[PDB]
UniProtKB/Swiss-Prot annotation:
PANTHER family attached to this UniProt entry: ENDOGLUCANASE, PUTATIVE (AFU_ORTHOLOGUE AFUA_5G01830)-RELATED, GLUCAN ENDO-1,6-BETA-GLUCOSIDASE B
One Pfam family hit: Cellulase
GO CC aspect terms: cell surface; extracellular region
Functional summary from the UniProt entry: This enzyme catalyzes the endohydrolysis of 1,4-beta-glucosidic linkages in cellulose, lichenin and cereal beta-D-glucans.
BP-aspect Gene Ontology terms: cellulose catabolic process
Catalytic activity: Endohydrolysis of (1->4)-beta-D-glucosidic linkages in cellulose, lichenin and cereal beta-D-glucans
Similarity remark: Belongs to the glycosyl hydrolase 5 (cellulase A) family.
Sorted UniProt keywords: Carbohydrate metabolism, Cellulose degradation, Glycosidase, Hydrolase, Polysaccharide degradation
Protein name, entry field: Endoglucanase C
Gene for this chain: celC
One term of GO molecular function: beta-glucosidase activity
Active-site feature positions: Q132 (proton donor), E272 (nucleophile)
Length: 332
């Protein structure tokens, strides 16, 4: 039996790669990595991929077997170590996806193709449709998601599909998803609360970079009022002034997902959650311990971000954990 409860992400491999290089692709993740993950106790891996490894915008419809090989081999390694694999589309075609039906067509076609390609794999693979959803409302995503589900179901009636909502799969956007009468659906949400703690000093976040402050957990945001005074552009941060960071805050942020499930009686999954590696170790470990305990209390499976690199590393390049206590907590 394969399970999808205590996983880890393989971001930075065939998704969010620096340069499109075969050297990177052949070496970033190898069988030794899957072996390490399996020996640690995780039951599955989440594999983000960006469309270009599979389809070029030029010869649309012509799928690259060379890119597909990275996915095929990962499936092999997973089957070998009895791990599940959640195949996740990070960057879809198009942002114009919800504007251009051609982009919509390619998106659906790519999933139709993958459903066919992996039709004989019944227990080690699951599909997670799309990660990047940031829209004014869910109307357009709901339309595309339904077509995609439909297209896939004509080919595979029992393939498990992972579906997330708007606002980067926010837990409070699940309620805005169209009702899918389907029993093989798992609802996904990401969780990085409190943001200025999990992304403190994240170089890719303008506000976090402007704030440029170390934060501990449990603890409290400090100097917000002083920061806003100097930077009126970030006035909205005044809402966070002196916010107390503790386990009850995390429980409150998780509430919307729990309420949705209480109504839908569905399965929930947290595909991404984590803390930036530069945070102090003690706080980093404590946040995971508290969050994992909430996931276990509510029986919600998930995958921590990230296996290696991507600034959220759980393992060094030497395939050794940054902290053994941390890995133990995450493997449940």
């Amino acid at each position: 039996m394969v399970s999808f409860k205590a996983g880890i992400n393989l971001g930075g491999w065939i998704s969010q790669y620096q340069v499109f290089s075969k050297e990177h692709f052949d070496t970033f993740i190898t069988e030794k990595d899957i072996e390490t993950i399996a020996e640690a106790g995780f039951d599955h891996v989440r594999l983000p991929f960006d469309y270009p490894i599979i389809e070029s915008d030029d010869n649309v419809g012509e799928y690259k077997e060379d890119g597909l090989s990275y996915i095929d081999r990962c499936l092999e390694w997973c089957k070998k170590y009895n791990l599940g694999l959640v195949l996740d589309m990070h960057h879809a075609p198009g942002s114009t996806l919800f504007e251009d039906p051609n982009q919509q067509k390619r998106f659906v076609d790519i999933w139709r193709f993958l459903a066919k390609r992996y039709i004989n794999e019944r227990e080690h693979i699951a599909f997670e449709l799309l990660n990047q959803v940031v829209e004014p409302d869910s109307t357009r995503w709901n339309k595309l998601m339904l077509e995609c589900i439909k297209a896939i179901r004509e080919i595979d009636s029992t393939m498990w599909l992972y579906i997330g909502g708007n606002n980067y799969n926010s837990p409070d956007e699940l309620k805005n998803l169209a009702d899918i009468d389907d029993d093989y659906i798992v609802y996904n949400f990401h969780f990085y609360n409190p943001f200025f703690f999990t992304h403190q000093k994240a170089h890719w976040s303008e506000s976090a970079m402007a704030y440029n402050r170390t934060v501990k957990y449990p603890g409290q945001y400090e100097g917000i009022e002083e920061f806003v005074k100097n930077n009126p552009k970030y006035s909205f941060m005044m809402e966070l002034n002196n916010l107390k960071l503790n386990k009850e805050l995390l429980r409150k942020d998780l509430k919307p997902a729990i309420e949705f499930r209480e109504k839908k009686k569905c399965k929930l999954y947290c595909g991404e959650f984590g803390v930036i590696a530069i945070a102090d170790l003690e706080s980093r470990i404590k946040w995971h311990e508290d969050y994992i305990s909430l996931l276990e209390e509510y029986d919600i499976g998930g995958a921590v971000w990230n296996y290696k690199k991507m600034d959220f590393e759980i393992y060094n390049e030497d395939r050794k954990p940054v902290s053994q206590e941390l890995v133990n907590i995450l493997a449940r």
